[PDB]
Design a protein around this ligand. Structure first.
Ligand SMILES: Oc1nnc(-c2ccccc2)o1
Ligand SMILES: [Zn+2]
Length: 140
């Protein structure tokens, strides 16, 4: 689990978005596994505006941050895990790393701020849903 809090936005994995996320829906993309909902409290996270391919992600299944090299956001086919079926996903970045189902929502960050959140796992790979192209997160 985990979210990004920037301005009056909460960013979550679409598949973990709560009833309260959906009630206050701003934006969702089923092809990206992202959902943004409205918050009343002004958030403190900064979104990275960069093309870094290096950063640090939080892995709850190891209670550790790992430094990783990651691919540029792409359209990538995601294979079936234990709890979720397979499918395609856009704006997806892969790294060599540990990722289990409950790891979704762990933040990937570089010196410029938040890059993405954990979205996919399995086969010694971690997938991050990129948020750096959502410029609108940095006002109103
Ligand atoms: O599956 C699901 N998650 N949230 C909702 C919801 C939220 C508000 C009103 C109706 C439904 O539905
Ligand atoms: Zn960066």
């Amino acid at each position: 689990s985990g979210a990004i809090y920037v301005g009056n936005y909460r960013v979550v994995n679409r598949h973990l978005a709560t009833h309260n996320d959906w009630a206050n829906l701003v934006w969702e993309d089923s092809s990206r596994d992202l959902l943004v909902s409205s918050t009343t409290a002004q958030g403190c996270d900064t979104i990275a505006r960069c093309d870094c391919q290096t950063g640090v992600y939080y892995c709850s299944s190891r209670r550790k941050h790992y430094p990783v090299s990651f691919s540029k956001p792409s359209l990538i086919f995601v294979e079936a895990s234990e709890y979720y079926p397979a499918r395609y996903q856009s704006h997806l970045m892969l790294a060599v790393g540990h990722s289990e189902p409950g790891d979704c929502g762990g933040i990937l960050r570089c010196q410029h701020g938040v890059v993405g959140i954990v979205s996919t796992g399995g086969n010694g790979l971690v997938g991050f849903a990129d948020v750096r192209d959502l410029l609108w997160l940095d006002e109103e």
